Design a protein around this ligand. Structure first.
Ligand SMILES: Cc1cc2c(cc1C)N(C[C@H](O)[C@H](O)[C@H](O)COP(=O)(O)O)c1[nH]c(=O)[nH]c(=O)c1N2
Ligand SMILES: [Cl-]
Length: 368
């Protein structure tokens, strides 16, 4: 019942507390524009009753930001205009639509402008490239990003956010998670800089704080700006935030107090303790800031979502795999209908919309 309670997010009035989590589908045009297949794809979640749809990570600039081939952008006016009809379709079905803004950093696998990658420090990520986005084998070692490249990246977030607002999105989500550029700056392991972008766990927030400030100047004070945060990285799902609960509370507070309107946190298991003992990562955030907290990670069933909301571990519930398994997830929960089990073969060999549609046709598994 709490899942189907309306809520407010700044000036936005959301019909329920169900959100579609951001998911990279590498189904845009080769030079970054969104398209009609993406229109139908995103509209389907809105028709399925989600109160809020968060886009896949959208790149921000025409320099290093693009992380995957056929990833959409918001860097140019052509990119902006290509999203308009998608925004309109999601809105016509009654969902708010938030543009996730992301810079690939050290986790880039394909970028049409450069083979060179940039990161706070020249440290190769561990793990291995995600083949279903295009690419195989070890991550490249990134070049240490320069002050001029940092300023270009900040300006790109601001411009992409202004483009999101102009295209009609209801908000932006700054991608500070999952091992991408902003998270690399947050992290102790990968931000080894000795300048004013490095330091202790608070000093390392300076780049995300600068991005928040620049974005807020570009979009004004009435537009929704959130940030996604995680301990995990795509290159290392076991990584922890330095310290424990108290240092986590301080990061959440610093970022929120810079003028975010929500936090979105993601963990391998949203219900598990963040630091081995004690509260979940989402619960820590919700107990340290007044703005809404969207939680995420392994939330599959209606009962699981309801438990997280009714226990006070989060204000909204973002689902990825469950939304792909049933685009009408919130409606099916209300009707007591069974859910489909998520089946990762739908992403083989590339996680594109086209491959999903072929898989659904072969398996009789309608999204709605
Ligand atoms: C195909 C695909 C693509 C992406 C993701 C996932 C999947 C399956 N995830 C992570 C996603 O938002 C979510 O956090 C995880 O899938 C875990 O939550 P669920 O268990 O799926 O509810 C992700 N997260 C994000 O912040 N930006 C992104 O672009 C993507 N890309
Ligand atoms: Cl850290």
């Amino acid at each position: 019942s709490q899942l189907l309670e309306p809520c407010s997010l700044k000036h936005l009035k959301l019909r329920n507390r169900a959100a579609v989590a951001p998911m990279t589908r590498v189904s845009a045009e080769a030079e970054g524009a969104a398209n009609e297949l993406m229109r139908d794809y995103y509209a389907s979640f809105a028709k399925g009753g989600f109160g809020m749809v968060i886009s896949e990570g959208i790149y921000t600039d025409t320099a290093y930001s693009q992380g995957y081939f056929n990833q959409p952008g918001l860097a140019t006016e052509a990119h902006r205009d290509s999203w308009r009809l998608i925004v309109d379709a999601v809105h016509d079905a009654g969902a708010a639509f938030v543009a996730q803004l992301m810079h690939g950093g050290a986790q880039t696998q394909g970028n049409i402008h450069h083979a060179r990658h940039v990161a706070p420090s020249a440290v190769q990520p561990g793990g291995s490239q995600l083949t279903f986005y295009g690419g195989e084998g070890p991550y490249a070692t990134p070049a240490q990003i320069s002050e001029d490249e940092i300023q270009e990246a900040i300006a790109g977030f601001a411009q992409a956010a202004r483009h999101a607002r102009e295209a009609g999105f209801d908000g932006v989500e700054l991608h500070g998670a999952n091992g991408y550029l902003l998270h690399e700056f947050i992290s102790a392991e990968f931000n080894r800089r000795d300048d004013h972008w490095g330091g202790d766990y608070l000093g390392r927030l300076r780049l995300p704080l600068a991005v928040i400030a620049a974005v807020r100047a570009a979009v004004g004070n009435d537009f929704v700006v959130g940030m996604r945060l995680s301990q995990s990285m795509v290159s290392d799902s076991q990584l922890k935030w330095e310290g424990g609960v108290d240092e986590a509370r301080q990061r959440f507070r610093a970022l929120a107090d810079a003028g975010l309107d929500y936090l979105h946190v993601t963990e391998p298991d949203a219900a598990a303790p963040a630091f081995g003992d004690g509260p979940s990562f989402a619960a820590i955030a919700k107990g340290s800031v007044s703005i809404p907290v969207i939680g995420n990670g392994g939330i599959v069933t209606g009962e699981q979502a309801e438990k997280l909301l009714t226990q006070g571990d989060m204000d909204l519930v973002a689902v990825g795999k469950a939304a792909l398994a049933n685009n009408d997830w919130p409606q099916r929960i209300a009707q007591g209908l069974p859910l489909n089990e998520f089946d990762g073969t739908m992403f083989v060999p590339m996680a594109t919309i086209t491959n999903e549609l072929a898989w659904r046709n072969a398996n009789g598994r309608s999204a709605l």
